[PDB]
């Protein structure tokens, strides 16, 4: 009909309102800032025991327990301090993309190409670990799982839909479908009232759990989007794409606040995370190195370069006192 | 230096031993993909071997444990999960010779992407040709020029089969570090599993020699 003509008028009108917002530039804003320095870290506790490619990791809220999933089919819960293992979980499916850890540290979530999300229970009267609830309902592979609390979980799948589940009843309560690509990562708000998720459609979307409907979109990339994470202030997030670049987004302004690139980097980005102060935008690329970049100074400085294969995942302790990154090398390296 | 940490360390060592045993049991097996265009008879192929999301089948033959992963339910961009199978031994690729009535060259396009993909630069491809009886019956009437204009040859079973095989083979670009094993089969054959076994043992020998540095 004539809606596409109207859609062009609205899409053109979108860019107009975007243009008038940039009252200044990040260069003007950050004119009074001391550069951080050539920050470097060293590997100090190397976890080993995985026999295949590692894909995902997540620190617990104790800042002491981390869970990692590999293609060997094993879910290992490490005691980070003594590098000894606490539990080892056999998985039904050996293809895993993401893992998660409950805020209460009593539950574990796994998922992969089997496009089923499974919750595992740790603290039991019996000694071992059993499967509590299995989440069926997606048509495409799960890419990222996160917990709101002990009763709720958000998943993202290749169906290009995100869902939210009540664990006790085991049925969805909200679908997020305005997207058009292939969703890759989720990040919850610090107050857990909203979340954001990029996809192969080169567009980032932010949603709202209560109403279950998209409220923001961005157009800032020429290829697939791989990972997202909230700025610890709950008013921004960062995007890492296949095109060797990262860009930051501010929600109250709805524009690309900053970018970070280089000429030598040509490989993509696999995972992204922030620190407690929000100064460091830690990201692991595909060229066997994990770069460290400051999302305000706009000059990546830290070359975290210990691994032997591509870096796949990285997380930051809730007290902001370390950083762990697993890679296809089958090792987990914790920096501090 | 330990009070309950002695119990912690033994727990860790016991489960590490368990992990090594499970990993050796995993490494004992050989892994194969299974791709197709949907209309391809991958269902008949899996039915030939005796016995939602990703479906896996186990079978053994002459004391060799085979695991096969069948994708095809995922109606998404393949490039994001095609790298998970970056260490499989071989790839089974099926096309239908009765490809003169589809909505064809689409499977050739599928073959081109999979045979030049950067993850499989040194992974062998087993090319199964299916529906040979129906192909002969159909080609007895339909023309080979309907699909291939540049073709020039007899309307004969052997000539058409050889031409199709040649067009599939020359799509390979890295024949120095690659091999395509071709086979004509149908819904009544029984030597397809033995052909798979021969190809797989050849790939195993090749990989062992490449580890030993003699190849």
């Amino acid at each position, epitope marked *: 009909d004539q809606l596409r003509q109207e859609a062009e008028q609205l899409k053109n009108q979108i860019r107009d309102a975007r243009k008038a917002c940039a009252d200044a530039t990040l260069s003007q804003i950050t004119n009074n800032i001391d550069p951080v320095g050539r920050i470097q870290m060293r590997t100090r506790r190397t976890l080993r025991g995985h026999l295949a490619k590692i894909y995902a990791m997540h620190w617990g809220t104790d800042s002491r327990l981390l869970v990692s999933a590999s293609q060997d089919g094993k879910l290992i819960i490490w005691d980070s301090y003594t590098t000894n293992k606490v539990h080892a979980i056999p998985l039904r499916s050996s293809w895993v993309m993401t893992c998660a850890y409950a805020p209460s540290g009593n539950y574990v979530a796994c998922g992969g190409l089997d496009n089923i999300c499974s919750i595992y229970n740790l603290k039991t*009267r*019996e000694g071992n670990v059993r499967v509590s609830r299995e989440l069926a309902g997606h048509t495409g592979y799960l890419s990222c799982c996160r917990f709101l609390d002990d009763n709720q979980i958000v998943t993202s799948s290749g169906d290009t839909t995100c869902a939210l589940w009540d664990i006790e009843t085991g049925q969805q309560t909200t679908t997020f479908t305005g997207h058009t690509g292939d969703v890759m990562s989720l990040s919850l708000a610090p107050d857990t009232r909203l979340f954001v998720s990029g996809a192969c459609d080169a567009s980032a979307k932010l949603w709202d759990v209560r109403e279950g409907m998209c409220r923001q979109t961005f157009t800032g990339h020429e290829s697939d989007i791989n990972a997202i994470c909230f700025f610890p202030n709950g008013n921004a997030f960062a995007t890492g794409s296949d095109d060797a670049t990262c860009r930051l987004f501010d929600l109250r302004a709805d524009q690309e606040l900053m970018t970070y690139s280089h000429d030598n980097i040509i490989c993509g980005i696999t995972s992204v995370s922030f620190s407690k102060s929000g100064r460091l935008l830690l990201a692991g690329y595909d060229d066997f190195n994990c770069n460290v970049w400051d999302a305000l100074k706009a000059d990546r400085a830290g070359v975290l370069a210990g691994h032997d294969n591509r870096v796949s995942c990285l997380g930051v302790t809730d007290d902001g006192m370390a950083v762990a990154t697993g890679s296809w090398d089958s090792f987990l390296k914790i920096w501090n | 230096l330990s009070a309950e*940490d002695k119990a912690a360390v*033994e*727990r860790s060592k016991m489960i590490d031993r368990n992990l090594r045993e499970d990993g050796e049991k995993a490494a004992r097996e050989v892994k194969l993909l299974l791709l197709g265009a949907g209309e391809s008879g991958k269902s008949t192929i899996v039915k030939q071997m005796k016995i939602t999301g990703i479906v896996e089948t186990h079978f053994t033959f002459k004391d060799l444990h085979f695991k096969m992963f069948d994708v095809g339910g995922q109606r998404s961009e393949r490039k994001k999960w095609i790298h998970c199978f970056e260490g499989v031994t071989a790839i089974i690729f099926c096309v239908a010779l009765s490809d003169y009535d589809l909505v064809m060259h689409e499977s050739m396009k599928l073959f081109d992407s999979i045979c030049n993909n950067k993850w499989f630069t040194d992974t062998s491809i087993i090319l199964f040709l299916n529906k040979k009886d129906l192909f002969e019956e159909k080609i007895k009437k339909s023309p080979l020029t309907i699909c291939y204009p540049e073709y020039a040859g007899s309307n004969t079973y052997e000539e058409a089969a050889a031409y199709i095989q040649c067009q599939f083979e020359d799509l390979n670009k890295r024949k120095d570090t690659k091999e395509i094993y071709t086979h004509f089969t149908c819904a009544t054959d029984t030597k397809n599993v033995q052909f798979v076994f021969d190809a797989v043992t050849d790939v195993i020998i090749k990989n062992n020699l490449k580890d030993c540095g003699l190849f």
Partner: single-chain antibody
Framework: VQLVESQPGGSRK???????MHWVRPEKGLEWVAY????????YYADTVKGRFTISRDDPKNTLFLQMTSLRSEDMYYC??????????????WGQTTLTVADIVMTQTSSVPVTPGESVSISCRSS???????????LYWFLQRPGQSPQLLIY???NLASGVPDRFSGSGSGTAFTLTISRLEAEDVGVYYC?????????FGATKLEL
């Protein structure tokens, strides 16, 4: 969840079993005797009976044998399980069983009367310190009603356990240790105990808290 324990000089002898499991010790006090480390890796015995009391486990059989021999006059006994790892609750489940014939010390106080509702507090005395370098302090409390079994009410003097109403508490400082109950109920009467777990010989305590 289920652990039922089944002539001087003589001799005599659920849930996930494959993963310590200790033994414990007549109108008198109660103390540790002997134990296991899961997986039969490391074994320690009692320094007071070392030589004539044997221990043995059979995971596929799912049993437990304590071969005691050459009975001295220093002779109830009970079986206990302790699935041990970080953040675990060892000794969390005891059972019931009497056979009538240079280290740390854990000396409690004899008794004290109370009334329901009135707050009650307990203290204890140790020999050396218990704050190991790793970061935590090892001591377990055990209520024991008459005609009943001791329970792991508190472990590591800060953490409650399953089934524990959260009116208890705990604290410690060097050697001085405490324990408090806010609102004593009809099911809060019986002798207490203790156990230090830093040096493996587990010196227990003697408090028959009458109403």
């Amino acid at each position: 969840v289920q652990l039922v324990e089944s002539q001087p000089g003589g001799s005599r002898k659920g849930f996930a079993f494959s993963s310590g499991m200790h033994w414990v010790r007549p109108e008198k006090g109660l103390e540790w005797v002997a134990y296991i480390s899961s997986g039969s890796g490391t074994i320690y015995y009692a320094d007071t009976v070392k030589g004539r009391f044997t221990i043995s486990r059979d995971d596929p059989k799912n049993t437990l044998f304590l071969q005691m021999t050459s009975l001295r006059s220093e002779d109830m006994y009970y079986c206990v399980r302790s699935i041990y790892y970080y953040g675990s609750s060892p000794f969390d489940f005891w059972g019931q069983t009497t056979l009538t014939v240079a280290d740390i010390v854990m000396t409690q106080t004899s008794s004290v009367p109370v009334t329901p509702g009135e707050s009650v507090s307990i203290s204890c005395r140790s020999s050396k310190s218990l704050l190991h370098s790793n970061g935590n302090t090892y001591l377990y409390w055990f209520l024991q009603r008459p005609g009943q079994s001791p329970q792991l009410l508190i472990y590591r003097m800060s953490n409650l356990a399953s089934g524990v109403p959260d009116r208890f508490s705990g604290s410690g400082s060097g050697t001085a240790f405490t324990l408090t109950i806010s609102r004593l109920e009809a099911e809060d009467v019986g002798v207490y105990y203790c156990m230090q777990h830093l040096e493996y010989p587990l010196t227990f305590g003697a408090t028959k808290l009458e109403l």
